[PDB]
Amino acid sequence: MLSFCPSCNNMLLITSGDSGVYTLACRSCPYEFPIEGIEIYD
């Protein structure tokens, strides 16, 4: 989906949250996301 984190600005990968929730966080640095993710390519 090619997203990025403020500050460090590397990449955002989807990680499985415990018990039912699906989240995403930047690797090696603390962060979390509200989801509602979307992408479209033609």
Partner 1 sequence: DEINTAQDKWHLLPAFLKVKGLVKQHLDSFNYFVDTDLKKIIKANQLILSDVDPEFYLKYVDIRVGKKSSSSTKDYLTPPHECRLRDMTYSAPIYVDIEYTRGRNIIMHKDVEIGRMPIMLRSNKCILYDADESKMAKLNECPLDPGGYFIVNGTEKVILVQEQLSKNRIIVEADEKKGIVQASVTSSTHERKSKTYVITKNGKIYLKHNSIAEEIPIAIVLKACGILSDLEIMQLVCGNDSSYQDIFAVNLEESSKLDIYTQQQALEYIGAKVKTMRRQKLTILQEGIEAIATTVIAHLTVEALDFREKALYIAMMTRRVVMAMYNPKMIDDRDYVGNKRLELAGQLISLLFEDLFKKFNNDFKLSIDKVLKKPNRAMEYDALLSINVHSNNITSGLNRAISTGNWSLKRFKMERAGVTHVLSRLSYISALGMMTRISSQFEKSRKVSGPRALQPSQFGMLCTADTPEGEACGLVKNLALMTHITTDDEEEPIKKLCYVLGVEDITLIDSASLHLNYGVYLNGTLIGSIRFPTKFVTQFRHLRRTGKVSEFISIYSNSHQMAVHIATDGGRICRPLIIVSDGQSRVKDIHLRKLLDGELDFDDFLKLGLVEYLDVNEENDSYIALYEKDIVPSMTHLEIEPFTILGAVAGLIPYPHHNQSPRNTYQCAMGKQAIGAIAYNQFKRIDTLLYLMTYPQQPMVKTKTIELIDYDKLPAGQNATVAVMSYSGYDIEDALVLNKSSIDRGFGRCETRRKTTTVLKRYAN
Partner 2 sequence: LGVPRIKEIINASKVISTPIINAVLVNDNDERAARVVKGRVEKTLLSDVAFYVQDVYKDNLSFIQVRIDLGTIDKLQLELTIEDIAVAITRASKLKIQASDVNIIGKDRIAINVFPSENDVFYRMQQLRRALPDVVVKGLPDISRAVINIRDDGKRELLVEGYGLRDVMCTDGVIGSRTTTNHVLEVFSVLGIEAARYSIIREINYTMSNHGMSVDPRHIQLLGDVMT
Partner 3 sequence: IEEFPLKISGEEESLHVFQYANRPRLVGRKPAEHPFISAARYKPKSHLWEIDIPLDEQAFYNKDKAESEWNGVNVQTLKGVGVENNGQYAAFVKDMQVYLVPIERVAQLKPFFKYIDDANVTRKQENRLTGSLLAHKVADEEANIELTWAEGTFEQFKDTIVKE
User: Is residue 24 close enough to count as binding Zn ion by CB under 5 A?
Assistant: no
**10 carries a ligand binding annotation:** no
Task: State yes or no: residue 2 binds partner 1 (CB under 8 A).
Answer: yes
CA quadruple 9, 11, 17, 20: dihedral sign:
positive
Which one of residues 10, 13, 29, 32 is an interface residue with partner 2 (CB under 8 A)?
13
33 forms part of the interface with partner 3 (CB under 8 A)? yes
Residue among 1, 19, 3, 38 nearest 27 (CA): 3
What is the rounded distance in angstroms from the CA atom of residue 29 to the CA atom of residue 1? Answer: 19
Residues in binding site for Zn(2+): 5, 8, 26, 29
